[model samples]
Target chain A: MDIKINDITLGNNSPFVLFGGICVLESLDSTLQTCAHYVEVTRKLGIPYIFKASFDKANRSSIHSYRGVGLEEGLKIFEKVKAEFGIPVITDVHEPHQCQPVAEVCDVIQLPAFLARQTDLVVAMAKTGNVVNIKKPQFLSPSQMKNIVEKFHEAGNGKLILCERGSSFGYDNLVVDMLGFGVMKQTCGNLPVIFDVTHSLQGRRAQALDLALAGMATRLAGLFLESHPEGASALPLHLLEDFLIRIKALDDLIKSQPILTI
Target chain B: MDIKINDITLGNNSPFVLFGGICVLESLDSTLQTCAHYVEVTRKLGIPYIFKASFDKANRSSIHSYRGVGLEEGLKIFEKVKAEFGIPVITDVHEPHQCQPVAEVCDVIQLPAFLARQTDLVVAMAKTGNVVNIKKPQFLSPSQMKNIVEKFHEAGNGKLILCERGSSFGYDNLVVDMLGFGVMKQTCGNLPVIFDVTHSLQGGRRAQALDLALAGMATRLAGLFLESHALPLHLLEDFLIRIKALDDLIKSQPI
Candidate 1:
């Protein structure tokens, strides 16, 4: 069966669409409200909708740092949002055990960018049979992502989503390589190409908003975001807030202009 | 006056340190071994050293990727390496606040592989007046690092070092520009220029090694920095070993 995510079918000739954000879930009201806002806006855009959030931000720098709510709470929230909002929920999984539980709740289980090379993690996620969104590893080149996709399909699971968050620019910054999109699209097979806006252009809040809007119009499957209303002050917001808000702004813009061609 | 970190000092005709690592700390043994072996062999080659490791890999594609050993353990290991091997240590810090404490422990504290644009973090680390190594933001070109170093000095801090870890090659990798060394050396003023051999090659492992070695010789850095080990289990160890082999083969080649 040909896999389809949101409005864009996972195949060639698909316009670049996005599903943005994975904030620290402070409350159910916030989670639902965020998704509701996301669904409402994306519905207007005529774009594919995949709600991206991480239940557990397992890879935070400081050990005492805030990851998201635990797996169970995160999955429950994801399940509720998918059911109520009627949209596919996407999330990142760290350990093998998370695959089954997260797969049960989410439409797609995202393989975190850092673990793209962890052969075991990829195999386990693929075995869950949920649609897998494997982010391109920052340390790897775009050509290397081809090997990642091949790893999944060869494991007997071909339903995958390719996400380009960003690559290391210097010290804690990411630079979105515009050309990587075209190259990733061809190698991704029928998989939907998800251009992560919030994560890219991360500190340049204003420019990212503009870039996200245009990036959404030009790319493949969907855009991903991690946001909160108040930048850097909300729910002990992610280290970078401007980047997140600008990302959501892109979704809002896409929702505003449904028929807008890139 | 030139600044020195782990036998590699930076001044006119000074050698530079070669720093390398994957995005995050893989394991305790692996991290230590990677640096320990490099320290041993590079010293034999008469190269200076500044061991680079990250306690927490803050910026990764997924929120759930493996970070690293906590700060306590990470610091402990760095301290041990310094005490046991009597070599200065270097590491990347994410927050502006981590500057003093990390600087207190490490010989030098570096900016992340990504956040080179974060002026605040740069100044914060610079304020410690510790030998601060700034990896140029990959989004930026070689010339941009001058401003970062300038900002540090402007902040009333002068113990600075500039590193060319790598530049963004394409999605998922960075291209190591050998010429960047010369530019950093000429532009950054008295600060030492370190060519990160192991990391500069992670993008295209084989090609980068040759480029960096020749670049080191051509540039004639005071210190020819390298990170290598006896084995290739770790991301950095493999690259270092590859360079060391080439380095040995080249040296042995009869003139």
Candidate 2:
């Protein structure tokens, strides 16, 4: 299931899109500045860019956790970012009611993992006719994702995407089954599957990056991540820049070499 | 995580218990015949034995699939097998209501992989005070198993067993993450973790069998379970012979 967002195309065979942004909209300045860096880097590397931020994190474990800027303010910020930067924007919607308003400014609407199994929410998002990215839940198998896609298609929508964050490995840990990408593609009717490595273990960052490259080399649609300015614990802008450079270089290397097509 | 099933004790430190049987209770005669083969084989090899068969496979993909004989008939067969052979039995429970009845005849009641996360089923199985064997779900992570153990312990039951059946790899395939055995043991407070090698890959039988043995030796495996049919009778015998030799080699070594 390939999906188009503005001029960029997302599919397993297409050039990988770099879906990069901050974890949340910390502020208007930080959001624009971080996106500005990504837009510049992705443009120089010829990688398609999609800015991701959250409006409301409704499923936080604690009540006191930061839930992000409200919908009204966040959508306004997203409109300005889209207009000023000339890049597509993506953000997760927590409630079914937010789909219509979110689809107004955002090019792609995201289904959070916890809410991925909710039939009503899937219907609401599908009814918007906007491109949808369904985050694979920690509890669901790759094959079970076909049911979610069917739910969306049943609502008269076909532009669907699948994203893998990670699976529950052991207590307080997550493991990205490297084999899951192929499963998602084959089982979900060959949807554009994106790999997110930031949510996984920091110790596994290098290996996950290599796996992301291998997944792209095989059949991946895009790579998803969140960048930070401070670069303390979060993925830093400099690292992302270097990573994109390496990916672009590898693409060139593969293109230059004589490779047999299967 | 050690468990006592009647007289046989299962744990990583103790001799590995062979929890082997057919997929379902086909008939009273076939069940008894199969158990007799396993009992004699394991006895000659000095491996402790536990008989396993399902009364009902409630999660079959197709509705027309043969589930099993009903619980009533299945329990009678289990009882006769136990009494006639003087061996302990293990079988899975699909619903919370079946736990009490299933536990009455079965030595160890199993929490099916599909129903492993259902809290009501866990509570009911725990409340039975019978030794419970929880099959790790294909979709779940090894770390999340602690929550299941916590649910069991919080329900006033401490005797719990964890079994790995493999995780969903892609589509219809399943892969046993070799690293998961240690993770389950460490995270679940060293629960008696059993390896279910029957549902895994069939192409690389010898290599996969060796991997399972290595996983058992590397991690302190409590038990190993497998299912076989009457047609490929020699395959099961060959596997038993290899596993016995591996057990003998490991028994002579020091860690």
Candidate 3:
């Protein structure tokens, strides 16, 4: 199914969208500066782009950890960024009540991994009549995603996107099942599937650059990352830009192939 | 950790037990005849044997599909076979109410793959104080098995076993993640782990066999679950010989 996020098109066969931004809105200036870097880079590479951030890190393990700016302030930053860059924005919503206001400002409302199965949340998001991105839970297998998609459709919404992070391998460890992208595409009615490389701790370092390529090689819907200038040697802004360039080149190369006669 | 099931011991370090049988009890005569063949073959080959057959396949896709003869009749056959052959037996239980009765007759009460997460069933089986076999669900990851194990331990049952029956890959298909066996052992407190080789449809017999061997090579494997027919006696014997050889070859060179 083709999911039209504003003027940009997202589908199994459509050009990949770069869902890139900070993990959480650190501050107004930092968030805008980071969004500026991503918009500038993604536009230069001619990639269909969507800016992503979380209004609240609802499921953070530690109570003391940094949760993002609350929905009110976060939406203010998101509005300013979207108005300045004229780009579609995405942010995750924790509770069912937050979906409406989040969807109002953000182009896509995200279902957090831990709360992906909350029926009330699904209904609220569906009622918003906005595009939804469902994060594949670390504990769920790829084939089980059909049930989640069915829930969305049952609630009267079809403009859904599936996101893959990684599967729980052992305690405190994640393993990106590379074959999962293909499985999700085949089983989830060919929904637009994207790889969330930043949250997937297993391959988030320099290894994730190739891991994103591997995911894109399966012709996934998009690549999701959290790029920052502070971590220049770790996950640099330029590495993400380079990865997007190769993704487009790959899409072009695949497009060049003629359909083979059986 | 070693799981002592009656006189037989199953562990990553101990000899692998063949928990093999038909999928369900078809008839008294057929069940006895099949048990006779397995007992004779396994005794001759010196393989630790556990007779496996479900009393009722409670999670069948279709209601019309044959579930085993009900628990009463099925347990009669199981008791008869165990008495005549003097071998241990294993069978699956669906509900908490069936756990005590099933545990009385069967050496190991298996948790169905679909219902492995049911707390009531887990508590009932744990209360039985019998060796429990928890089948890893097709939808769950290996790390999630820890939560399941914690439930068992918290229920005052440490005599536990973990069984892997492949995870859901695509619609109506299953794929065995070879790395999962090791992950289960590491995360689930080194519990005795086994592989269910019959239901994984993506790779049929040879693929399952290769996976069993691969698991053995990677770590000391606890057990293997397989369903066989009378016509395939030679296949079972051949598999037994090769696994024994591989086990010895592995023992010869230690990590």
Candidate 4:
């Protein structure tokens, strides 16, 4: 089944959509610069791009850290990105109260991994008549994602995309289970599956290219990514072109194959 | 805690230690023979060694396995092997009452990962004043070990070791995180940690046994724990040869 987001159609059988942007909505100019870089590359490569960011900042080592930009302000930022780039926008919404308004501006509303099981937020996100990106939790098995999807159907919204961040491998680290992508596509009626290669760095004996290539080999509907200089080292801005060049070839080869039914 | 079990020094030491043995005490002679194989191979490799086996088969179903040799006979078997081999024994104590009785013969008493959170068992093991090895629970975070280790310290037993057996990957799967050792060491006062290769094995064969242990030993643990359940006795010596080859290179590093 194809998930139509405006003019773009995302499905398991199509060329993967690339979801990339800054980790957080920094300053308005910072957001535009980040979006511009992504937009230029994605267009040049002929890949559909969705500008992604969080409405608020989080994961602080301490409470005194910089707080996130609140919901309305976050929606305001998304409006600007959509208006400026004229590109599709995707961001996350946590609380129930923020769902409807967030769904209005943000084309895709994502469920966070920590709160992935909260029925309260799921129902709200489902009711917004917006596309929901469900993050596979570290603790939950891939087969169990069906139950979360069942909840969205009960709430009457089939517009959904499944995202894999990583699973809890051990203390303070995560691992990408390569086979998990296949499990999600089969288990969730072959929904458009995306891999968030950034957070999966938590051996990592394997590098991002190795992880990304392994994931893309499983044939995802898209790839979710973020690169930055500060915080956890990421795919540097300069290397993303080369990096995507490699991934684009893999994705192209994969999406071109006939889906093998085993 | 300055400690030495028999003539061998354990964990965070100069040469790595090997805690190897049968998975269960199948018989007195079976135990004697297996211990001799491990003892012979380890001594030749110059690896400090200790014996490991579980006495309780309470969890496993049977064929004359009606329950493992009871704690009484199990301790006797350990005593004879200790006396014959002049080596130390490391085994698990399930019941709180078994701790003191088991510690009487065993040099190191183990806290099973499932029972690691059992405050009574932990307190009981701590009371024995013997070196204790706490298996890292597959589900618990390594940082959270600070609290579990605190429970032992608060009980006045500072001689503790944290063992890694990998963590639950998804369903019945297990994955050994090569980076997990440093997390436990950094968070828990740099206590000597060992890697349990057999318990962490899920994929297949003894072929990977060396590979997984090699990957883990590169982390430079104080000890390496393994079992001969799948390993043929004849191949045991060659296995140690490959292990010590890598272990030697690791220990030779200036870090």
The sequence of per-residue lDDT tens digits that candidate 2 reaches over residues A122-238 is: 999999999998988877877788999999989998898888876775566565654566667767788888877666442233444444444444346788866655211455555
Question: Using lDDT as the measure, which candidate wins?
Answer: 4
User: TM-score of candidate 2's chain B against its reference?
Assistant: 0.91
lDDT per residue, candidate 1, B176-243, as tens digits?
Answer: 54445556666777466655555555433343343344334333343334443311434343444434
Q: Write the per-residue lDDT of candidate 3 for residues A134-198, one digit (tens) a residue.
A: 99999998889999999999989988999998887546766666557767777888889888876
Task: Tell me the tens digit of each residue's lDDT in model 4 across B1-255.
Answer: 235776877666456788888777767998998889888877777878899887877576655655767787888999999889999989998889888988899999999989989999999999999999999999887788889989999999989989998778768988765546767877888788888888887722554565466556655678888888466755667666666755665465444
Identify the superior model by DockQ, candidate 1 or candidate 2. Answer: 2
Q: Per-prediction TM-score, please?
A: 0.46, 0.51, 0.51, 0.54
Q: Write down the worst ten-residue block by lDDT for model 1 chain B.
A: B246-255
Off by over 4 Å in 2: A202-207, A230-233, A250-262, B1-255
Highest TM-score among the candidates is held by which one? 4
Local accuracy of candidate 3 as per-residue lDDT tens digits, B1-255: 888777898887777788888888979899999888888888898889999998777778797888879899999999998889888999988889998988888998888888887889989999999998898998998889999999999999999899888777557866556557667877888888887766643422443353234333334467877778821666677666655644543344332
- Report lDDT (CA) for all predictions: 0.62, 0.75, 0.77, 0.78
Q: Count clashes in each candidate, considering only residues at least 3 apart in sequence or on different chains.
A: 35, 6, 0, 2
Model 3's CAPRI class? incorrect
Instruction: List the candidate 1 regions with Cα displacement exceeding 4 Å.
Output: A6-12, A170-172, A213-218, A230-262, B1-255
Q: Between candidates 2 and 4, name the one with more favorable lDDT.
A: 4
User: Fnat per model, in the order given?
Assistant: 0.00, 0.00, 0.00, 0.02
Q: In model 2, what is the error at residue B145, expressed in angstroms?
A: 24
Residue pairs with backbone overlap in model 4: A57-A68, A174-A202
* Candidate 4 per-residue C-alpha lDDT over A158-259 given as tens digits, one digit per residue, 9 for 90 to 100: 888999888875477686655566667777898999988877764222256545655665567888877543244466777677667766866775566454
lDDT of 2 by residue, B1-255 (tens): 677787988876677788889888879999999899888878876788999998876777798888889799999999999999899989988788888988888989988888888899999999899998899999988889999999999999988888888887557866666457667877888878888877644333443453344334333477778776622445555566655544444444442
Clashing pairs in 3: none
